[PDB]
Design a protein. Structure first.
Lengths: 513, 51, 515, 515
């Protein structure tokens, strides 16, 4: 994430705006864009003004059925296509995403409310997801040999697991959808994507791009719609054995329960209440920058947000105070403005839920230091009452509080004190979640020690969340299961096969002799 | 041959026969949790917010 | 002098028994399943470094004994490399079991022969047993590798196979531990062996052969030839039936061996010299750092390849820290190997003492400041006269990294302390030698630690601790310290050969020629 | 003779142009980022294997040129090994891209210089581009290894670092493909390079240097020194600043190089000679087998290291099968490298043709039965006079595995057919060679195929097919065919150094010494 990002021309922005309201965002099924059979659609708001940006086809079980059949029918040929050819398609898709980057940026900025200074990197990462997994396509069947002396040869290989139903969140539509779509396609599987209803546009755009890449029909399908309708239908469909989910923990339970009906394989990346542990001996200037960014970037709407700030008592007053002042100075404004740091939340219904947590925090004794209410003015004087803007918020509280135990998914931070390493660790792990954790300290042994004991899928020492694609990404506890990233994704998208064969006449027990 | 097993190999089924694998290192993917630990070797670039 | 009824858990009676058998029984070669002398009948003596008296004699092997040993290993390779891994595993476990049963004898024998304190040698016997117990578990995985399927058209898979007989040439400081370090993997991976141990401490090897025979290894699988490096050693390196060679010794010996090995393009796995540095920063736990650097250079009588012979200390604490190193070295108890109070014993041979003292003199003449030691130990901690043994006082110099005592391996209890003003300079000086075996870094700063770990040219880096090994990790050095690696699966790359097997799943296109 | 308007998709005009450029421009060295001649001004010529006339000349490099190249590689190593992997990947992809851009010129140049059929050289250029595009994807994984945590007390982890400047010494048969096979991985993994190409076909190498300069590699990262093996070659092997060495050539050269490399304990990755056998069983798809064995020995003018120079055929089908091989060989079209209908071109140099004829003669006096060929090809399939070129007729002998023609590498279109009574014998004869590069088995029986694949002493075994490669697999030989492996992650073991880093998670126990 660069310190400065270029703006998109006024004309391009205006062109994207009219194209969104000019034509409904349709499903992509069996190689073509189509509306729901009912003809029904649903609207998607522009979080900066709460005005309708456009509408998308309202898919149900009928559209999902057609999509699942299409994916199933195309699985035979796609899984048998040469890896080198699948690689070519993915690299092409990566190329085209870069070519349409400005469009995608505007689209997600207006639809999801993320700032351009974040969205540009997201679009770049979306293309990268394809370029990255394109190099794994040719290694997708590889595993091991287990020879036994000169008597037997056992060898293992991997084969595409089958159609994948990808259910994605609304915070980073393109980024988190391509993150699952790329490996799925690379590994020989077909796909049915069901985008979050609160930000469906970039998905239809992605479909246009995959069509421009001339991906075979049925290989990639898209079905816009509500989770309770198109979503639930996808989870229940007999022809889609694999499901990836990125959302709330409770949604994971619902999806898993319904998935049992067909013993489906699930790869869920759920919520989190990732802690940031700041020790007195750390580089406090870097720690301040990291913590402020890790909770307020993405408008605080990201699973790896450091929503709990554990600070060593001896520096609690000074450090937390510096965090408050920084949050106070955060530039709140329109997403398209390249200067904006924090934009509006996704939907008024989400802003309501977040305000609900703020209020609950007050009622339970948490000490509100800054924010905690709707933003009225931007950093440029603009009136922001029409959008879903929340001021960056900082509370001082106790780890057992509701606002410290439940995911808020908003720019709300809770600062909690700890007397020593043992207590910092205890409090850090005392959560139902376990996605990420951040530790700021200069002591070598303390750092690695905490990294080993912190119950999280990812631990970042002395920095914010900086990712390296080949590493296993995922959570423990209530944050999900399974891992994405390089070869680790292989374990979910493919099946292992052990093939055995004797090198000479083996001993075969005699029965009925 | 008939079913002759070598314990280190991944054992399990596909479709209606189950999921996951048992056997040597493959058992590890089920009984254990992976963890990725990151750390910079020199002052990294951290985006500035509220400066 | 009977210092106690038991030392390192060994009865004094056992100690005297072992000493007596060494003088009574010549150490013979073990060839084609039998103990035999050299055809010439010649033998060579081995001294007791504590008194320089003859402990006993060992057969002086030459080209003829080596030829017979190589033929035996070669002839037996055919059957041994095809034995079931489970069966080889059984043998290694039996060997480990028998080493443990003869532990007291082995400890005393090597102690008397090589001069290390008995308790340390006893712990080394345990490590030797562990070497076999460890690799016993890799035997059944020795053929394993990967599959590289190509869509539905081809299947490529790889396997590993025993590479061939291994000539194992070892040093005089730790006979049992260093020889079993190579023998165990060689055998586990299906190869036969011909061991040629250092001539200054031959006894333990003949004893080891006795044990392998007690384990009932097939004839020819393990062979032993005692003798001088230029005789038995060079003959083994030159023999056409021993394709693999492991060498643990001096860097210069590595050059001579490689040159000789070229005639048959032999595969070599050398673990050579070292001049490993210890870098102590002002922000580290100085109490632990002090314990570590003192131990890392003076333990094992300074005759340890991974010894931190160069101590780099940040300037702002140089005077105080180095001063503390000096007082600790001054307090080190020097005495007989069989005395439980001894911390530093005698060097291996008078010739080695003359060489080490030669370096001490080189240091004095080049401007190095001698702070302690620098000459023979006259009296033991108990007031005994030590003039008959090869005892050297723990020695500490303050010098510069360009000095000869800083650049060349002394292989004795001699340390050279060198200052550095900052991280950049600490790293530059650390890497400025022709060696690259180990390195030790003492600092509490997370980023500086990993940064230096990545930049230090060494096969092994230890952060905030002395040398503590974990067998599965790759062990070896860079630069003049050798090449290749030992340890778990890493050893496989040397002892086995990779093979890529390909087969089409359907009729492939064969270019048409002459059709 | 203008054979056509276009050959291998290349216009005759382009062919003529490349040909005259060679006569006008001497092939210079590329040192420290600039093309330079030898300080002495000396040069040596390269012949056109089709007419034995001088195509052009190349600078005759010696010790002074190698010294300058080694220093440049050394000096550049510091920064190059520290460049970001993503940036090195960009460079390799740029090189790959530029190789394709200059593909026609490279194809013609090497065709003219080394004598292979133009379309085959053109295909080889595509493989050279692929070498860079392939390793480009490994650059970012070059430091990766493992973690070996020990409970909650220790963390041991391993990484890999660039090993150092690499001296690449290559053969004359396939200049571009074989040099890039080593250059690509060397650069991808952070090492600098000094290339010393075979003197019989130097042009392509200088062209490759022009291309790398076009890709704008930093000065000193890639250096080239033209010259003879005993001059520039030996100088490179002996230079102290080039720690790693790749050699692709004859086994005898490997011995000489290893001996010379001993002086600085250099790491060698040799791919040497071979006498790869093809085993044909009565139950195999004999039509595919026939196409496969004919191609595997006669393609590439028989100058391919993996050529199946020995044909082992089961007795009951020996007469029929070998008879068919003979007729196919008789039908092979011998002609000029630029003639689209040519199947077999001229050998590299008159000295080589004579060397091959020497073996043909030796085989006859030896008792081998010549079935076809066995002498110079004086007339092409079009009736042209080929007497001024180095053309050999595809040759087929029936002999015994112990014969010199069966034991020694001829490196030409010469085949030796040998019979076998059964699997046991086929395996015995197949392995009874001082070589062990490749092996080909033709049989439909599952268990026999895998059984033979496991027992055949070769680095690569192909079942029911000719030589079809998959880059990620380990490529190399055993016995006299070399050591080490190239290909994907296997090349890492040679181009990088492993490092084990250890750190305690809590205060460890350091043995108390001197207190
Ligand atoms: N890297 C390691 O792991 C490691 C471990 C232990 C000891 N060492 C090193 O070993 C050295 C101690 O060596 P040493 O005194 O035994 O030296 P050394 O090299 O002379 O002895 C090693 C072996 O080499 C044999 N040898 C000597 N000349 C030979 C020749 N021309 N041909 C064939 N064999 C020959 C000897 O007989 C002996 O068995 C030190 O430099 C120490 O650092 C290294
Ligand atoms: N294993 C493989 O992958 C592979 C691939 C291609 C060719 N080959 C083998 O290479 C051979 C063809 O070899 P060639 O005719 O180029 O032979 P060669 O060994 O004489 O030439 C190889 C390189 O060695 C250099 N050289 C020669 N003498 C030298 C010395 N004293 N010091 C340093 N360098 C020296 C030469 O200048 C040349 O660049 C065949 O035996 C073939 O089997 C093997
Ligand atoms: Na929206
Ligand atoms: Na001795
Ligand atoms: Na020595
Ligand atoms: Na030529
Ligand atoms: Na040659």
């Amino acid at each position: 994430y660069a310190d400065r990002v270029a703006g998109i021309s006024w004309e391009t922005i205006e062109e994207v705006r009219r194209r969104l309201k000019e034509r409904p965002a349709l499903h992509f099924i069996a190689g073509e864009f189509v509306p729901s059979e009912s003809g029904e659609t649903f609207p998607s708001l522009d979080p900066a003004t709460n005005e309708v940006l456009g509408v998308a086809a309202r898919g149900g079980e009928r559209e999902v059925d057609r999509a699942a059949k299409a994916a199933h029918e195309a699985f035979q040929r796609w899984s048998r296509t040469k890896a080198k050819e699948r690689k070519r398609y993915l690299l092409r898709i990566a190329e085209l995403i870069e070519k349409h980057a400005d469009e995608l940026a505007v689209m997600e900025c207006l639809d999801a409310g993320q700032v351009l200074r974040i969205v540009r990197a997201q679009v770049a990462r979306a293309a990268e997801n394809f370029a990255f997994y394109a190099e794994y396509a040719e290694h997708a069947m590889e595993d091991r040999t287990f020879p036994v002396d000169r008597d037997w040869l056992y060898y293992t290989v991997r084969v595409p697991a089958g159609p994948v139903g990808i259910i994605t969140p609304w915070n980073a539509p393109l980024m988190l959808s391509t993150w699952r779509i790329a490996p799925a396609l690379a590994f020989g599987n077909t796909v049915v994507l069901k985008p979050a209803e609160w930000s469906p546009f970039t998905a239809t755009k992605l479909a246009e791009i995959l069509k421009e890449a001339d991906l075979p029909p049925g290989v990639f399908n898209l079905v816009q719609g509500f989770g309770e309708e198109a979503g639930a239908a996808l989870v229940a469909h007999p022809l889609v054995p694999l499901l990836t989910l990125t959302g709330e923990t409770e949604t994971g339970k619902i999806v898993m329960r319904n998935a049992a009906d067909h013993l489906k394989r699930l790869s869920p990346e759920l919520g989190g209440k990732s802690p940031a542990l700041v020790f007195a001996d750390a580089d406090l200037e870097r720690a301040l920058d990291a913590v402020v960014f890790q909770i307020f970037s993405f408008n605080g709407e990201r699973c790896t947000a450091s929503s709990r700030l554990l600070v060593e008592e001896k520096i609690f007053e000074d450090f937390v105070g510096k965090v408050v002042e920084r949050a106070r100075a955060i530039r709140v404004g329109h997403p398209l403005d390249p200067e904006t740091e924090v934009g509006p939340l996704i939907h008024p219904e989400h802003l309501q839920r977040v305000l609900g947590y703020v209020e609950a925090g007050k009622r339970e004794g948490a000490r509100l230091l800054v924010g905690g209410e709707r933003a009225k003015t931007s950093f440029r004087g603009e009136d922001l009452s029409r959008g879903n803007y929340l001021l960056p918020t900082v509370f001082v509280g106790e780890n057992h509080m509701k606002i410290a135990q439940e995911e808020i998914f908003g720019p709300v931070l809770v600062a909690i004190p700890f007397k020593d390493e043992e207590e910092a660790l205890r409090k850090a792990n005392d959560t139902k979640y376990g996605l990420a954790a951040y530790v700021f300290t200069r002591d070598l042994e303390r750092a690695h020690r905490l990294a080993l004991e912190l119950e999280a899928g990812m631990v970042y020492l002395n920095s914010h969340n900086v990712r390296h694609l080949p590493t296993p990404f995922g959570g423990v506890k209530g944050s999900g299961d399974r891992r994405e990233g390089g070869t680790y994704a292989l374990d979910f998208y493919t099946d292992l096969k052990t093939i055995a064969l004797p090198l000479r006449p083996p001993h075969v027990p005699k029965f009925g002799k």
